[PDB]
Design an enzyme around this catalytic site. Structure first.
Site, short mmCIF file in Angstrom:
data_model
loop_
_atom_site.label_atom_id
_atom_site.label_comp_id
_atom_site.label_asym_id
_atom_site.label_seq_id
_atom_site.Cartn_x
_atom_site.Cartn_y
_atom_site.Cartn_z
N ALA A 106 0.82 -1.21 0.00
CA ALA A 106 0.00 0.00 0.00
C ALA A 106 0.85 1.26 0.00
O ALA A 106 0.42 2.30 -0.52
CB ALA A 106 -0.94 0.00 1.21
N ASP A 147 29.12 26.60 -27.81
CA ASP A 147 30.24 26.80 -28.71
C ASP A 147 29.92 27.90 -29.72
O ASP A 147 28.77 28.10 -30.11
CB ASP A 147 30.56 25.50 -29.45
CG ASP A 147 31.87 25.57 -30.21
OD1 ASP A 147 32.87 26.08 -29.65
OD2 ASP A 147 31.90 25.10 -31.37
N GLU A 189 37.02 32.22 -50.59
CA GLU A 189 36.78 32.14 -52.03
C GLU A 189 35.37 31.64 -52.33
O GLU A 189 34.69 32.18 -53.21
CB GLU A 189 37.82 31.23 -52.68
CG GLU A 189 39.25 31.71 -52.50
CD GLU A 189 40.14 31.34 -53.67
OE1 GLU A 189 39.99 30.22 -54.20
OE2 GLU A 189 40.98 32.18 -54.07
N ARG A 199 53.09 36.34 -49.10
CA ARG A 199 53.01 36.80 -47.72
C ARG A 199 53.32 38.29 -47.61
O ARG A 199 52.61 39.03 -46.94
CB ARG A 199 53.96 35.98 -46.84
CG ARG A 199 53.65 34.50 -46.80
CD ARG A 199 52.34 34.23 -46.07
NE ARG A 199 52.01 32.81 -46.02
CZ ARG A 199 52.39 31.99 -45.04
NH1 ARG A 199 53.11 32.45 -44.03
NH2 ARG A 199 52.05 30.71 -45.08
N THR A 231 34.56 29.04 -26.51
CA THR A 231 35.07 28.74 -27.83
C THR A 231 36.59 28.76 -27.81
O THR A 231 37.22 29.36 -26.94
CB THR A 231 34.55 29.73 -28.88
OG1 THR A 231 35.03 29.35 -30.18
CG2 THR A 231 35.03 31.14 -28.57
N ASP A 243 38.29 29.98 -30.48
CA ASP A 243 38.72 31.04 -31.37
C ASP A 243 39.27 32.22 -30.58
O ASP A 243 39.24 32.25 -29.35
CB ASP A 243 37.57 31.49 -32.27
CG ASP A 243 38.02 31.79 -33.69
OD1 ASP A 243 39.25 31.83 -33.93
OD2 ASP A 243 37.15 31.99 -34.56
N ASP A 282 29.33 21.44 -30.89
CA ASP A 282 29.64 20.50 -31.96
C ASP A 282 31.15 20.39 -32.04
O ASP A 282 31.89 21.20 -31.48
CB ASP A 282 29.05 20.95 -33.30
CG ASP A 282 29.85 22.06 -33.95
OD1 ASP A 282 30.30 22.98 -33.23
OD2 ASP A 282 30.04 22.00 -35.18
N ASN A 300 36.28 19.32 -29.91
CA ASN A 300 36.71 20.11 -28.75
C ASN A 300 35.62 20.24 -27.69
O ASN A 300 35.94 20.53 -26.53
CB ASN A 300 37.16 21.50 -29.20
CG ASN A 300 36.16 22.16 -30.13
OD1 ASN A 300 35.23 21.53 -30.62
ND2 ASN A 300 36.35 23.45 -30.38
N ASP A 301 34.36 20.04 -28.05
CA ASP A 301 33.27 20.10 -27.08
C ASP A 301 32.90 18.75 -26.51
O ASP A 301 32.06 18.69 -25.60
CB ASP A 301 32.03 20.73 -27.73
CG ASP A 301 32.28 22.14 -28.22
OD1 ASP A 301 33.19 22.81 -27.68
OD2 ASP A 301 31.57 22.57 -29.15
N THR A 334 -6.59 2.47 -11.79
CA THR A 334 -7.32 3.64 -11.32
C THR A 334 -6.37 4.75 -10.90
O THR A 334 -6.81 5.89 -10.69
CB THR A 334 -8.24 3.23 -10.17
OG1 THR A 334 -9.00 2.08 -10.55
CG2 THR A 334 -9.22 4.34 -9.81
F1 BEF Z 1 33.56 27.72 -31.28
BE1 BEF Z 1 33.86 26.36 -30.62
F2 BEF Z 1 35.27 26.34 -29.95
F3 BEF Z 1 33.87 25.25 -31.70
MG LIG Z 2 32.14 23.92 -33.05
#
Ligand code: BEF
Ligand SMILES: [Mg+2]
Length: 1012
Positions: free
Chosen positions: A305, A351, A442, A489, A618, A620, A696, A699-700, A792
């Site tokens: 119960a 990211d 490009e 360069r 990130t 970058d 994605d 690295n993540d 029930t």
């Molecule tokens: F901008 Be994440 F480091 F892919």
């Molecule tokens: Mg990414």
């Protein structure tokens, strides 16, 4: 082999005993094959169903369910004195549900796999290597590469293994490493060694990491790591090493189950104490030895119960419905409990490259020289609405559609963009989207040319295959290429010489060098000499585009209308390249970036409204990350970011006391390694905050495992999707907001029906305890309790799972994870409800005992001593003894319990709002389930075989009216409790009259005033 980047090519080649010109021998190949192994990442082992079943026992809810079932079966074996085999039915009916939801627990997971592995390109990596067997290069499988192999890589080829550069065949080598480090722009590579041994992957400019692809050039290299020893292998090992804890919903359920088990133990001890010492009566038992079986039967009935058997089933049903809703909304959910985790999420870590942005470079702003006089000029600005590589889009001049055919300067700009570059864009149906074949810049120029139809080429009836280069080809045929001066360069520019079918030479490069090397300007279709004012104007435009609110990659374009002819060309010298365009006609410049997805800014605003914090993590550089943060709305356009944006190196030097408010305040993190991402996620989790890491790429992958919930983009790597619990197939970032909304609604429904089930269970517990203490015969056998608590108590619970969502659901901060499902006052309310339910059931049984028109009249609690009367002793009354086993009190108690449960489900539509204000027909599923379960109860009463399995019998009109008379006051009690909770319509009342007034017709004294 360690620190290959720190060593020059000579000793790196010498270590493996391999020659660049020849390669490796077959004996060397097989020796390295057996020494190292296969050059592939091992797949996830198939989790067998037996192991899944045996690990499903870890949950405390199923733990208590299984222990209760085992004890019930053990006492079923104990009750060997009975003859009918139907008793052994009562444990078995439990086991079925213990499998059913479990199967679903596996089943949905399998479905998730069918949706995750389907979003994978199962194309084996096919790699070109040099070996001593043949002088020419040979193409082999990915797993056949061993360290020391000589590998030739070219444009568009995915890197098979970690390769130290030896020599670049082309001029310069560009590699896209957004997969491994989240860099939004291609990186140039060189053979020069990197002195620093602890250099980061971005610092290693002489390495070709696995998974990345080449953008521009062709190069030669030597393999230094394969399979697990590669960077992706190390990251995958780190991801596997990290342990993912239980979801917050699972933790709350475990705490609830522990509390429920403690309640069961306490009540069992209390009933044993209150029942011990009752053996002093002159009855059988052999000194409580044979009364122990009855005591344990009471204990197991109480345990049954007190355990809601149907709770896991309804929980699984609600989770599956949420998962199906995400499946409709293009979101794949790996685990059922993870669909609610986003509801309690407080911080979302995202990211930048590939997750917040499309990872596809595109041109957004361009300007052409419009009108020029002495020292002043007016420029024609344009805006491009394209966000991906798809050639669909429009050009806007001062926020209005415009056709570029009227602007000649736009025609020359398009010609230079289409001719000066050397990459292209293609469309495929396997993924059904557009990809690049060379450098991102490009193909961005190619997409910009395709978007603006300067020649008004027909496109309404053109196939998608030739849509990628529909007008670029049109430009190419009319002005055929001759040759190309490659990028230098020192020059920071590159040129294309071409002749018509006069003979202009186009040049594209950095703004400063191109504008310094030009001696003419183009105004419409006219050539104008140098004047300073236009130069400062365009230079100011260049730097306001580069360092303004939106950071763009400015690219200056010019054409030479009088270049030197083909015969007087010396292409063998790079120095001579610069002097060949000492006089140029500057046409214009364009601005390109990796743009955020169109659904990010609105989603960020919605998350801010819901109290959720959004943080960018990130790899970058800081400038690009801050620019994207400002674009999406994390930071303001003019907002200072001195203490809100940090780098990995900056965060490392920060004090932990400073790291405290850094994590609580900073919103941008740039240049961070996967270990740094996991450290940030762990630090955020250390503040009791639920983390939703969306991303994605490789690295993540560790962070996706470390966070409470991990979301992977459908275009991301397989490792990221493996490490995540949710997958966005369509790459829609607002799906996170939708999932958060349904998670909050789902948690509300969870609370509602868990509270309802606990009310029912405590009612049954109070009923059994009161029956045992009062000495009356049992009113509810355990099998009836199972039938009730499944049918029930699941049909109304399933209907409550369909509760209407609140209007203020997304405008409130996320809930505190430490709060319990049942508060103290709610616990008191539901305890009172359960006490009333138990009292009502016991009172119905006693009423049939003492005052029944068609029943006996053993009243005043006399002869109520169960298992005492045997013959016509003086305490025995006129009525017989077998009537104590009649099923009439049992079915009366069952009907009262069912009706009170129906009423409790009816008025549990809202947490606090009265049922008068919210009519029950708002949730049509609720009334539907109530009617269905009442119909099933009637079928149970009025069918052939079941009234034998259940010790019940059909009722009559008077007994049913008595049942409703007992059952209805629970609605009034719950309404009063809701009123006192709130303080401290007409159509519903119209339907109340045909029911309550009918109760007023008959009144009975109940003849029960002896004790209670
Ligand atoms: F901008 Be994440 F480091 F892919
Ligand atoms: Mg990414």
């Amino acid at each position: 082999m360690e620190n290959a980047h720190t060593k020059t090519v000579e000793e790196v080649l010498g270590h493996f005993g391999v020659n660049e010109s020849t390669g490796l021998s077959l004996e060397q190949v097989k020796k390295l094959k057996e020494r190292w192994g296969s050059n592939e990442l091992p797949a996830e082992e198939g989790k067998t169903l037996l192991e899944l079943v045996i690990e499903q026992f870890e949950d405390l809810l199923v733990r208590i369910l299984l222990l209760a079932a085992c004890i019930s079966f053990v006492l079923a074996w104990f009750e060997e004195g009975e003859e009918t085999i139907t008793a052994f039915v009562e444990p078995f009916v439990i086991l079925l549900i213990l499998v059913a939801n479990a199967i679903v627990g596996v089943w949905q997971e399998r479905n998730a796999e069918n949706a995750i592995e389907a979003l994978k390109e199962y194309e084996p990596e096919m790699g070109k290597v040099y070996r001593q067997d043949r002088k020419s290069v040979q193409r082999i499988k990915a797993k056949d590469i061993v360290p020391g192999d000589i590998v030739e890589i070219a444009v568009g080829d995915k890197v098979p293994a970690d390769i130290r550069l030896t020599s670049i065949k082309s001029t310069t080598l560009r590699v896209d490493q957004s997969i491994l480090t989240g860099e939004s722009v291609s990186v140039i590579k060189h053979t020069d060694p990197v002195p620093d041994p602890r250099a980061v992957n971005q610092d290693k400019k002489n390495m070709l990491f696995s998974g990345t692809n080449i953008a521009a050039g062709k190069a030669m290299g030597v393999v230094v790591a394969t399979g697990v020893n590669t960077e992706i292998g190390k990251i995958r090992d780190e991801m596997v090493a990290t342990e993912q804890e239980r979801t917050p919903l699972q933790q709350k359920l475990d705490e609830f189950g522990e509390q429920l088990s403690k309640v069961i133990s306490l009540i069992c001890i209390a009933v044993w104490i209150i029942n011990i010492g009752h053996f002093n009566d002159p009855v059988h038992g052999g000194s409580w030895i044979r009364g122990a079986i009855y005591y344990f039967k009471i204990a197991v009935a109480l345990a049954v119960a007190a355990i809601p058997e149907g709770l896991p089933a309804v929980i699984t049903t609600c989770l599956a419905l949420g998962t199906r809703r995400m499946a409709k909304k293009n979101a794949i959910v790996r685990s059922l409990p993870s669909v609610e985790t986003l509801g309690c999420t407080s911080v979302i870590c995202s990211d930048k490259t590939g997750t917040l942005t499309t990872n596809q470079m595109s041109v957004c702003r361009m300007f052409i020289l419009d009108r020029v006089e002495g020292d002043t000029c007016s420029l024609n600005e344009f805006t491009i609405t394209g966000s991906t590589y798809a050639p669909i889009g429009e050009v806007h001049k001062d926020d209005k559609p415009v056709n570029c055919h009227q602007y000649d300067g736009l025609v020359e700009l398009a010609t230079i963009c289409a001719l000066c570059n050397d990459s292209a864009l293609d469309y495929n149906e396997a993924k059904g989207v557009y990809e690049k074949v060379g450098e991102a810049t490009e193909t961005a120029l190619t997409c910009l040319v395709e978007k603006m139809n300067v020649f008004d080429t027909e496109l309404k009836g053109l196939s998608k295959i030739e849509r990628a280069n529909a007008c670029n080809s049109v430009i190419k045929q009319l002005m055929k290429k001759e040759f190309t001066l490659e990028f230098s360069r020192d020059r920071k520019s590159m040129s294309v010489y071409c002749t018509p079918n006069m003979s202009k030479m186009f040049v594209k490069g950095a703004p400063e060098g191109v504008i310094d090397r030009c001696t003419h300007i183009r105004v419409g279709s006219t050539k104008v000499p140098m004047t300073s004012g236009v130069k400062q104007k365009i230079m100011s435009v260049i730097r306001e585009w580069g360092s303004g609110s939106d950071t763009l990659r400015c690219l200056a374009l010019a054409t030479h209308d009088n270049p030197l002819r083909r015969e007087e060309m010396h292409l063998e010298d790079s120095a001579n390249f610069i002097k060949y365009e000492t006089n140029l006609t500057f046409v214009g410049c364009v601005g390109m970036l990796d743009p955020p997805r169109i659904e990010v800014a609105s989603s960020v605003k919605l998350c801010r409204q819901a109290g959720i914090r959004v943080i960018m993590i990130t790899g970058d550089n800081k400038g690009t990350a801050v620019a994207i943060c400002r674009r999406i709305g994390i930071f303001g356009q003019d907002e200072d970011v001195t203490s809100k944006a940090f780098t990995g190196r900056e965060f490392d030097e920060l004090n932990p006391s400073a790291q405290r408010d850094a994590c609580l305040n900073a919103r941008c993190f740039a240049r961070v390694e996967p270990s740094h991402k996991s450290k940030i996620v762990e630090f955020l989790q250390s503040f009791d905050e639920i983390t939703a890491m969306t991303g994605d790429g490789v690295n993540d992958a560790p962070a996706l495992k470390k966070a409470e919930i991990g979301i992977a983009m459908g275009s991301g790597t397989a490792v990221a999707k493996t490490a995540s619990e949710m997958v966005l197939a369509d790459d829609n970032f607002s799906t996170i907001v939708a999932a958060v909304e349904e998670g909050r609604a789902i948690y509300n429904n969870m609370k509602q029906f868990i509270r309802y089930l606990i009310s029912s269970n405590v009612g049954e517990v109070v009923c059994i305890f009161l029956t045992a203490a009062l000495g009356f015969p049992e009113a509810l056998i355990p099998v009836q309790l199972l039938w009730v608590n499944l049918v029930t108590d699941g049909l109304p619970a399933t209907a409550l799972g369909f509760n209407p969502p609140d209007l203020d659901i997304m405008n409130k901060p996320p809930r505190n994870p430490k709060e319990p499902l049942i508060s103290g006052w709610l616990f008191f309310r539901y305890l009172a409800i359960g006490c009333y339910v138990g009292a009502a059931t016991v009172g119905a049984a006693a009423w049939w005992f003492i005052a029944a028109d068609g029943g006996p009249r053993v009243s005043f609690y006399q002869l109520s001593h169960f298992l005492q009367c045997k013959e016509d002793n003086p305490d025995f009354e006129g009525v017989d003894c077998a009537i104590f086993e009649s099923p009439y009190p049992m079915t009366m108690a069952l009907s009262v319990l069912v009706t009170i449960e129906m009423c409790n489900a009816l008025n549990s539509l809202s947490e606090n709002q009265s049922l008068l204000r919210m009519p029950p027909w708002e949730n049509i599923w609720l009334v539907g389930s109530i009617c269905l379960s009442m119909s099933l109860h009637f079928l149970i009463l009025y069918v052939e075989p079941l009234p034998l399995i259940f010790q019940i019998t059909p009722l009559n009109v008077t007994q049913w009216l008595m049942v409703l008379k007992i059952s209805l006051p629970v609605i009034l009690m719950d309404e009063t409790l809701k009123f006192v909770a709130r303080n401290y319509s007409w159509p519903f009342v119209l339907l109340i009259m045909p029911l309550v007034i009918w109760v007023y017709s008959t009144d009975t004294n109940f003849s029960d005033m002896f004790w209670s």
